[PDB]
Amino acid sequence: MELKDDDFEKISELGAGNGGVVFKVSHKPSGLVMARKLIHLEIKPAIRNQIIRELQVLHECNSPYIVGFYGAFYSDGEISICMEHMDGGSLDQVLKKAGRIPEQILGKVSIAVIKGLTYLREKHKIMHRDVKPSNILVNSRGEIKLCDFGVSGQLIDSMANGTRSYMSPERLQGTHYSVQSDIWSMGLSLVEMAVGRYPIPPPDAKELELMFPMAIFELLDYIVNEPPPKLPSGVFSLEFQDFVNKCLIKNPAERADLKQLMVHAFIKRSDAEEVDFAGWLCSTIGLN
Amino acid sequence: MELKDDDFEKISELGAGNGGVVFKVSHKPSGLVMARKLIHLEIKPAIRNQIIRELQVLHECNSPYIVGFYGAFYSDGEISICMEHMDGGSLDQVLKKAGRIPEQILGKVSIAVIKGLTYLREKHKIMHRDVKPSNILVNSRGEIKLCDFGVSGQLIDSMANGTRSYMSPERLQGTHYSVQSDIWSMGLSLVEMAVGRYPIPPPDAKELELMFPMAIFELLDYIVNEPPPKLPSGVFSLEFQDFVNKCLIKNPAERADLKQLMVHAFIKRSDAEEVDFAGWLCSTIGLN
Ligand SMILES: Nc1ncnc2c1ncn2[C@@H]1O[C@H](COP(=O)(O)OP(=O)(O)OP(=O)(O)O)[C@@H](O)[C@H]1O
Ligand SMILES: Nc1ncnc2c1ncn2[C@@H]1O[C@H](COP(=O)(O)OP(=O)(O)OP(=O)(O)O)[C@@H](O)[C@H]1O
Ligand SMILES: O=C(NOCCO)c1cc(COCCO)c(F)c(F)c1Nc1ccc(I)cc1F
Ligand SMILES: O=C(NOCCO)c1cc(COCCO)c(F)c(F)c1Nc1ccc(I)cc1F
Ligand SMILES: [Mg+2]
Ligand SMILES: [Mg+2]
Structure with a gap:
């Protein structure tokens, strides 16, 4: 109706x-x-x-x-x-409650994002354009889903017009960006959720021990001209580290695409793993 | 009540x-x-x-x-x-209707902005923080007035969080900014209104003959690292040109302050001039 x-x-x-x-x-x-x-x-x-x-x-x-x-x-x-x-809200809200999201849970998040992005590209010939934790929603059934993507060309135009950005270096610098831009956003979103804060400027030695505001030109200059952020070593597996490294390659043509990420070791591993995402979600946010 | x-x-x-x-x-x-x-x-x-x-x-x-x-x-x-x-709305709305605001009218605008900023500083010990054409309001009595200034420290904090910026180079790059930042915003706002479009990136030779979208890292890099915008010569008096030049000096300590601008030739000249701002306003926006 x-x-x-x-x-x-x-x-x-x-x-x-x-x-x-x-x-x-x-x-x-x-x-x-x-x-x-x-x-x-x-x-x-x-x-x-x-x-x-x-x-x-x-x-x-x-x-x-x-x-x-x-x-x-x-x-x-x-x-x-x-x-x-x-009913689980978005991943930015869950991150606030969780402090930090387990690498195993982020394995399920990654799979769902890659699969959603693939579906949009394959079946609808579109890029998402706005991947970030608040556009990834979750529910008590253990579902992880994308919203707020660029379905409407005119709505994209009409919306055009931060203390933080998930936009790729190429998109920050001009019109020369496309589906690869979404991979960068996903990579950055995963580092934020793994580590428990927006990862730019990198956590120093002292911050890393202790867990384990920038002007906006400063922040965007960092994204474009400085090396990409990186997971801490020790606390995360080499598969996860390599996964986010391949998402956060600055040149968008050497950056992994969805096709590669889908067969990345980390995904294979997470694909295999038995994870009670639904139970994890509800405990951390207080559903049941 | x-x-x-x-x-x-x-x-x-x-x-x-x-x-x-x-x-x-x-x-x-x-x-x-x-x-x-x-x-x-x-x-x-x-x-x-x-x-x-x-x-x-x-x-x-x-x-x-x-x-x-x-x-x-x-x-x-x-x-x-x-x-x-x-009832005249803001200067961004009037600019849309006007195409372009006469230099004489911008003389009255300038006086009112400088006087409002002076009043806020002298009597309330505050900077405006958000000078731009939409925060300058006008009415059918010929009044020109500032709104949307930083009166509340907590509201400033809570609001913190574009395809265009009126923020000074120093404010774009960090915390080291103050009342001088407002002068830059005023200068840039006056160039926009004089010329009829947001003045960054500068109008080329062809655009200037013909009247007389940037990525956001591109735009902010321009503001910080490129020379400030400038009025066309020929169409505007040397007093106006020098006035906006003194507002748009990149170093905020050599940039003119309100005290200097108040005795700048352009202001003296505009101060003297008989201008029917109220009649100009109403004709261009269709009040009466
Ligand atoms: N379908 C939904 N179910 C449950 N909660 C939702 C849903 N859609 C949005 N929300 C909640 O509403 C919030 C606001 O959504 P909205 O898309 O307007 O803003 P955002 O995505 O957080 O940020 P921005 O507008 O800055 O991109 C989201 O953070 C999310 O928590
Ligand atoms: N006191 C007022 N009288 C008449 N019109 C007003 C008044 N205050 C605001 N407006 C109109 O409302 C519009 C929106 O105001 P608001 O301050 O929310 O947004 P803005 O200043 O245009 O932009 P931004 O929120 O991006 O800074 C202004 O452009 C102005 O045209
Ligand atoms: O809402 C949206 N963005 O959020 C910004 C806070 O409003 C949104 C934006 C656009 C256009 O911008 C694309 C990104 O540049 C669009 F086409 C949408 F369909 C949107 N919404 C949307 C899409 C799919 C679902 I399922 C549910 C939705 F609400
Ligand atoms: O509204 C405001 N900003 O506008 C942004 C669209 O909402 C606004 C913002 C702040 C804080 O931010 C300062 C700039 O960084 C503030 F303290 C205000 F009092 C504001 N409003 C305001 C002030 C004086 C009058 I007279 C009428 C007003 F509505
Ligand atoms: Mg959203
Ligand atoms: Mg306003």
Whole structure:
């Protein structure tokens, strides 16, 4: 059935970021609990209609590694995107509660990200464009899924316009970037989650012992002109270290792609491992 | 009297930016039309109360060059700042309608900015921190006034977190910036308004004849490492050119301060000039 503004009842606020709020809502005709994202854009009616039209391809984005979509519509000054409610929230929220995410859990995260990115590329011919811990959602069933990807060319354009960045060196410097940019973001996101803080500027000797704000030109100059961040040695396996190293190669053509990462030792190893992600999640965030 | 959420009725939406919406509202007990800015922050109750408390100093910020303040309060997830409604809107909106602002009008703009900044420094011991055309508001009485300055230390902190920047080279590179940073922003804002587009990267020969998007590392690298932008010669007086040159000196200690700019030839000249700013405004934006 068609979604409209009327038919929704607000339960609570799940969070907000830059240009969006997301509510936990009841869709009253169906009884279904959803996450309803509201994007406020001051744009002409014809552009707004193209955006809505282009979000309908989300009905066709069906994957265990992609957040379910129910519908998208416009109502007073706001574009609504209605999606599956993910009761574990995002990986940035889980990281705050966890302090630090176990390497084994990050093995399952990595698999799901690579698989979601692969699905988007293979089946929809698109890059994600916004990989970072807050765009990876989890639930009490142990599901790990991507949201907030570039499905709509016009919405990409209209959104265009930090104390931290997940954008690749090539994307920071110009228009010459593509699917490889997403690999860098994934790599950086994994280092942050492994280590328990945004990893740029690198943890010094003292910080590493103790666990185991930058101006924005300073930060972006670092990303482009300094060597990429790196997992600590000792605390993480050489497979994981090599995995994030291959994600964080500055030249995007020598950086590993999804095809290579899918057969990387670390993935093979994680693929094999018996991990109770669902139980880990619930304990750390207090679901059950 | 005290302002509360109840007592307000929404008339229309004046605009929105990064972290705020502003509505044209009727305060029903008084009959007064106001601009009510809503800032949504996910912050603990004790911080939120410090913010509200620190915004009360706006009751004490009374100046012909500062947007009037009526009150600030918190209600469901939102900090409200209620201010004087400026029926001419901001200088970014007027620039869109005008294409380009006459040098004589920019003389009056400059005077009002310098005087507002001086008032804030002299009487309140604060820097503005966010000078740019959208934070300079105008009205049909010919008034030009500053809003959106750093009155609250805690709100500054809580807000911390572009395809364009008005931030000085020193502020882009670190913590070593202060009131001089505002002078750079003013200078850059005046060049944008004079010329009719954000002036970085400089207009080439062909663009200048014809009137008379950058990656964000590219843009900020330009601001820090390349020579400052400059007014075209020919179309603008040497006084104006020298004025913006003195604002846009990269070293903030040799950059002119407010004291010097107040006695700069351009100001003396503009101070003397008979300009119908109110009539110019209304014609260009269609008020009367
Ligand atoms: N489908 C969902 N289910 C559960 N929680 C969600 C869902 N979508 C979003 N959220 C929560 O809402 C928050 C805000 O989402 P939003 O995408 O607007 O901002 P963001 O992604 O954190 O950051 P930014 O806007 O800066 O990119 C997310 O951090 C996430 O915690
Ligand atoms: N007191 C006011 N009277 C009339 N219009 C206003 C007033 N305050 C704000 N506005 C309008 O509301 C718009 C949005 O304000 P806001 O400060 O939220 O964003 P901004 O200043 O444009 O940009 P940003 O948030 O990116 O700094 C402004 O451009 C201005 O046009
Ligand atoms: O919301 C989005 N970004 O979040 C920024 C805080 O609003 C978003 C952005 C774009 C365009 O920008 C692409 C990145 O440059 C887009 F096309 C979307 F479809 C988006 N949303 C979205 C996508 C898939 C699902 I399943 C659920 C969603 F909500
Ligand atoms: O709103 C503000 N910024 O705008 C960004 C879109 O929300 C704003 C920000 C700060 C803190 O940040 C300082 C700059 O770094 C502050 F202290 C304010 F009082 C603000 N508002 C404000 C100030 C004076 C008047 I008169 C009316 C106002 F609305
Ligand atoms: Mg998001
Ligand atoms: Mg503003």
